Design a protein around this ligand. Structure first.
Ligand SMILES: CO[C@H]1O[C@H](CO)[C@@H](O)[C@H](O)[C@@H]1O
Ligand SMILES: CO[C@H]1O[C@H](CO)[C@@H](O)[C@H](O)[C@@H]1O
Ligand SMILES: CO[C@H]1O[C@H](CO)[C@@H](O)[C@H](O)[C@@H]1O
Ligand SMILES: CO[C@H]1O[C@H](CO)[C@@H](O)[C@H](O)[C@@H]1O
Ligand SMILES: [Ca+2]
Ligand SMILES: [Ca+2]
Ligand SMILES: [Ca+2]
Ligand SMILES: [Ca+2]
Ligand SMILES: [Cl-]
Ligand SMILES: [Mn+2]
Ligand SMILES: [Mn+2]
Ligand SMILES: [Mn+2]
Ligand SMILES: [Mn+2]
Lengths: 237, 237, 237, 237
């Protein structure tokens, strides 16, 4: 089925599928039940930044999420990604709403991947940076309810003309080129991702979250992954 | 037809279709008949480097070609590319042989495109660097006889089982993602491309050349563009 | 005296020394009497961005100054910087006030310089980026009235406690390390600089201007270079 | 006196001061007696590469040293550099010889430092890359016997007119500008360095090693630090 490695910024606690009782960031390796989670004091209506890093020497996937003038929330998990992902993957951003909702607006997204093979000075690298998203963003594969161009931002889920987010929405944006995330001959392989977001709920419970994910090239939103499954997993096992 | 802007490293003089009597480098805006050329002392068997630059403030497309510890050849041509290209394009390398041949080996290729819109610091960028090509290079669209992996090099043209170049061979390699080369509200847009090559002909008349090109997203090798046409033009007009 | 190559953002027309009768942008090659100028529709109190570029193939220095949602002013001048500057230089920003004043606030500054030798893939490069300045910015040499850390900004000229800009002030900030701007054996050399500024005046006319400059490593403010000489030149010749 | 954090490529075992009995790489935090080492299969006369990385989320310093088509040695140590270093430092390479000698040639060196503060998208960065070194490399501070320009390389220790290394030699090369390696107000701070080296010993047993270090700005070679102290430490404690 799809192979997903994700860093989720989960705003709604689904204690039934193992979520902690508060907003949290977590690392998901092929399941929505995070291998590692950390509390996140989500600030509704404020722009935040998420930063994810990994390198093949330390084999640790780490993430930092923060808001200006506030404490960060960090989570790390040791994982050798060549035992989990195909070597060519596609990276993206995913989001969803269920009964409760929130806007899942992405204001900027950048990614850098590098593979140093055992050949002096030969580094293969891919870097993309988006600080504005256009109406016809031909280098992004949009799935589900995702739209771009609106205010130069990327709306992962449905927002109405007045600005209210909609329930039961799911949307994803993937970078068009495959990324060679690992290689057996590389001395060092590394990647870093950064994205700023604006999650705003009009009421007391925002839902559901935003996730940065890495997947097999041909990944598609699994059926029924709205709400708690962050448009990433088919079930909650 | 295909809207092609290219920088050719042409080794064979096809005087009938306007090539000057010597190997040269030329800027091709939509035609094989270069709008500007400069003499190039091709050094058979040596690794050369080609660097191409362009920015929208100056609107001058420039290329420089050099071999270590030897002269460099340079050619420049002023052209407002927003009037020649679509805003989304694909960039690539092309090459060919006709009666005469030469290996058209690419050892490294990097490219960087940046668009700075009217809003300060919101730069959109794309950068890729290939210093080693894998047998299955999933981020390259190879069209024609190009093969990756042998020596960790990109062979744009057919080379026999035993290392010899083959005649009437044509090949192209394009980066998978579309590139947003220009944008209406961009204050500055620029790109840079560099690639090292190895052209070795077993004969006293190496032919036909290597060319860096920018084209419409769905460009294909034209029918019969072998030899003199370098895999880019349909005719020689 | 010192060897100065500068891009001025001149807010006060000193018709007597050759200025246009309107705010303008100019390229000064060792004299305050610009070799080339362009009209500039300065917007008092708004954050602007200036981009300066140059490469040894074209030997053209170009600058573009812009405000969001407005046209940009552009100026270019062909000049071979290898015949004007020493191969090692320092780069910095300069500003002054005279009878009239204006804040000369720098909100961000980045620079990148590359020198490619004719020895293949052997690029030497220097890049710095400041999006905020600290009270103790050890990698900057502050000259005159320039101070850092005032709300993370660099104030090149005097601004009193209550916010008022002061008359007869001059300040310069140069990056600490020398920069290898050109070299004989280099195939291509280029640099690019970008800075955002905030020019605000309370009085009728703002004065005098902000300039991006490149100089000999040991350059200092000429005495009396307040006002029209922008903290860069000794006299008006 | 100085605060030194270093990654040594130790070619000579001095078992008396805690060295393993084989060539090794190690992480020295204020002492030549490494807090962690890894066995290194040093190859006499071959160009090697070392990569050093660190980030403030993981707080792990790691190094990988490798030769083309041979395997790599890797070593990591968990250390919070915010508690060991000053926030402003200088970075450099150091090397020494004693009774036994070896060439300690650096053929290339690059460094990148990044710091994102408590403001949106406000990263400060510094990056430098040297693939060629000139006779008067003004952006490097050379200490002891270190010289540049010989073959376009950096010789950290004495080498005679023919190419033979000298014993009892110490040399260091530091980048000119201070580097802001950490700040309280940062969300993420990281750095990476890479250098290629050529260690060749005619006298069969090479000694003593090359080290990448980070120090207080004003660091100088400790007197008596030739041999086993690698130009970094005052004694063997
Ligand atoms: C109350 O349960 C529903 O709403 C929450 C929040 O939207 C979702 O997580 C869940 O999957 C359901 O759709
Ligand atoms: C002589 O003509 C043939 O050979 C030359 C050089 O190969 C090609 O340019 C041409 O298109 C034909 O194939
Ligand atoms: C009136 O002249 C003074 O003020 C103007 C504008 O401030 C400056 O240009 C000039 O050099 C003097 O300092
Ligand atoms: C014999 O001891 C000397 O030589 C060895 C190897 O060079 C060094 O480690 C040591 O510090 C002394 O200088
Ligand atoms: Ca949840
Ligand atoms: Ca031809
Ligand atoms: Ca003036
Ligand atoms: Ca030792
Ligand atoms: Cl005067
Ligand atoms: Mn969760
Ligand atoms: Mn031609
Ligand atoms: Mn003027
Ligand atoms: Mn040791």
């Amino acid at each position: 089925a799809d192979t997903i490695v994700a860093v989720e910024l989960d705003t709604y606690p689904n204690t039934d599928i193992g979520d902690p009782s508060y907003p949290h960031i977590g690392i998901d390796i092929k399941s929505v039940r995070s291998k590692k989670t950390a509390k996140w004091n989500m600030q509704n209506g404020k722009v935040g930044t998420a930063h994810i890093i990994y390198n093949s020497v330390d084999k640790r996937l780490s993430a930092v999420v923060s808001y200006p003038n506030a404490d960060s929330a960090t989570v790390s998990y040791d994982v050798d990604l060549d035992n989990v992902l195909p070597e060519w993957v596609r990276v993206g951003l995913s989001a969803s709403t269920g009964l409760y909702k929130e806007t899942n607006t992405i204001l900027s997204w950048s990614f850098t991947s590098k593979l140093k093979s055992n050949s002096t000075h030969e580094t293969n690298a891919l870097h993309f940076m988006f600080n504005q998203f256009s109406k016809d963003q031909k280098d992004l594969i949009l799935q589900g309810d995702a739209t771009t161009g609106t205010d130069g931002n990327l709306e992962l889920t449905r927002v109405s003309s007045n600005g209210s987010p909609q329930g039961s929405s799911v949307g994803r944006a993937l970078f068009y080129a495959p990324v060679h995330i690992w290689e057996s001959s590389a001395v060092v392989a590394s990647f870093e991702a950064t994205f700023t977001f604006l999650i705003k709920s009009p009421d007391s419970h925002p839902a559901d979250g935003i996730a940065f994910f890495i997947s097999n090239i041909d990944s598609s939103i699994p059926s029924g992954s709205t709400g708690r499954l962050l448009g990433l997993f088919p079930d909650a096992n």
